Ligand binder design. Structure first.
Ligand SMILES: *C(Cc1cc(C(F)(F)F)nc(O)n1)c1ccc(Cl)cc1Cl
Ligand SMILES: *[C@@H](Cc1cc(C(F)(F)F)nc(O)n1)c1ccc(Cl)cc1Cl
Ligand SMILES: Oc1nc(/C=C/c2ccc(Cl)cc2Cl)cc(C(F)(F)F)n1
Ligand code: NA
Ligand code: NA
Ligand SMILES: [Zn+2]
Ligand SMILES: [Zn+2]
Lengths: 298, 110
């Protein structure tokens, strides 16, 4: 039970290699709750454990790193997740957050509205998503791949994520997308990570580490989601907030990762090697401009 | 400004809630407003924007340029006053010398 001192649990490799059929998610610990430190909310605890886990990976961390956070608005109109990200990220890191409804944030810039109304030509080094629609869960119908904001997430990754960049996208039993799992195979490494504080939920963060811009491995998203549920159904995770009490090593270490603009024909096997180790980011470094569309009508 | 909030609390109103409290070591410098949580053993750290009356109420900030000194930062609040961060920040003022709250860390008058 040494997992209880971890920030969470990552899906073991052997589970990723199965060919399971999708089944209903039935968690043994479904209904339990972890004991959070006094006055700490779940959204802060959850993001703290995600960042503690991301610290163990080979994230590229360049100067003036660029991070974008989707589905950042809470019901109360604030942005707890954004507050944790800004705590975690090196000072001066550009942080932009976004959601469908208005909220107050610590981000450098906040975008309100859906994908079709926001645009940028700039590339990003890290994408975090907590976007989730509770109405997606419907146990009376078949649990198929969801094609709403997920299609936009996939498009954003393939067009606006810098080579060497990483993502952490929130999924659940019912909130998932086959193409997103497939796109996990375009990273040097990937996993599905479950926070210890929210282990009673089917929620997980699909983490793609070091984007290669091409399929390193072929992943069938339908199968992999089934594999994810199989793992959750057969591996009870003990609810734990233990990792929250030791924040001494929390800040993301500055690596000063090199950024450079390379032509597609210049991306060779040795560049891929650098990308895969979190030692290189490929994108331009122009002024960051975000556009917001407004439908005008009388 | 404080004007109305103080009267709201004086009458017996509910202090603004949902201020974002952060996890931290509680071994920080203890300064009032910092780029990262700096709560000491007698303080709590909160996300700045959530503790700012102006940001929360979506009203302009009292500054010709409209600069917010909380948004994007962390505010340290004495644990004894953590039940109302917005109120505490309004009522108190930060020391321009040591960057500590007056009567809550600042000892420049000794
Ligand atoms: C701020 C409450 C408030 C609103 C107004 C306004 F409506 F005139 F703009 N003025 C003052 O002074 N105060 C507030 C606090 C917390 C939440 Cl969740 C929402 C609001 Cl609007
Ligand atoms: C904090 C004021 C305060 C409260 C206590 C208590 F714990 F005994 F209640 N002790 C001390 O020393 N100080 C405070 C200040 C200003 C505002 Cl607007 C609100 C609060 Cl909670
Ligand atoms: O082109 C562009 N897209 C977006 C956001 C897409 C999106 C994807 C998934 C989800 Cl869940 C929500 C959104 Cl909004 C954002 C930007 C900009 F913000 F950088 F300008 N620029
Ligand atoms: Na930080
Ligand atoms: Na004040
Ligand atoms: Zn403000
Ligand atoms: Zn002083």
């Amino acid at each position: 039970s040494s997992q209880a001192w971890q920030p969470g649990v990552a899906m073991p490799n052997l589970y990723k290699m199965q060919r399971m059929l999708l089944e209903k998610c039935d968690l043994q610990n479904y209904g339990d709750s972890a004991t959070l430190p006094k006055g700490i909310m779940m959204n802060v605890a959850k993001y703290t454990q995600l960042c503690q886990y991301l610290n163990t990976l080979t994230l590229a961390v360049p100067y003036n790193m660029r991070v974008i956070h989707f589905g950042a608005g809470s019901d109360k109109g604030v942005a707890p997740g954004t507050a944790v990200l800004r705590q975690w990220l090196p000072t001066g890191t550009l942080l932009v957050d976004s959601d469908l409804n208005d909220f107050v944030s610590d981000a450098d810039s906040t975008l309100i509205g859906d994908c079709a109304t926001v645009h940028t030509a700039n590339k990003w080094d890290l994408i975090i998503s907590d976007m989730y629609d509770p109405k997606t869960k419907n146990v009376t119908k078949e649990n198929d791949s969801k094609e709403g904001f997920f299609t936009y997430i996939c498009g954003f990754i393939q067009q606006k994520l810098a080579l060497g960049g990483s993502v952490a996208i929130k999924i659940t039993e019912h909130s998932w997308n086959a193409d997103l799992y497939k796109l996990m195979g375009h990273f040097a490494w990937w996993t599905a990570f479950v926070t210890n504080v929210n282990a009673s939920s089917s929620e997980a963060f699909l983490i793609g580490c070091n984007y290669l811009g091409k399929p390193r491995e072929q992943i069938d998203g339908y199968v992999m989601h089934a594999n994810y549920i199989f793992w959750r159904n057969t591996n009870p995770i003990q609810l734990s907030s233990y990792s929250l009490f030791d924040m001494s090593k929390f800040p993301l270490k500055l690596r000063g990762t090199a950024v450079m603009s390379l032509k597609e024909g210049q991306i060779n096997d040795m560049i891929l090697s650098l990308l895969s180790k979190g030692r290189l980011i490929i994108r331009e470094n122009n002024r960051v401009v975000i556009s917001s569309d407004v439908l005008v009508n009388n | 400004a404080a004007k109305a909030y103080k009267d709201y609390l004086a009458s017996g109103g509910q202090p603004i809630t949902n201020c974002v409290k952060m996890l931290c070591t509680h071994t920080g410098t203890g300064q009032a407003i910092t780029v990262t949580p700096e709560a000491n053993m007698d303080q709590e750290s909160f996300g700045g924007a959530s503790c700012c009356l102006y940001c929360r109420c979506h009203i302009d900030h009292p500054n010709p340029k409209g600069f917010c000194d909380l948004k994007g930062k962390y505010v340290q609040i004495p644990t004894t006053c953590a039940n109302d961060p917005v109120g505490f920040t309004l009522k108190n003022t930060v020391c321009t010398v040591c960057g500590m709250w007056k009567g809550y860390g600042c000892s420049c008058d000794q």
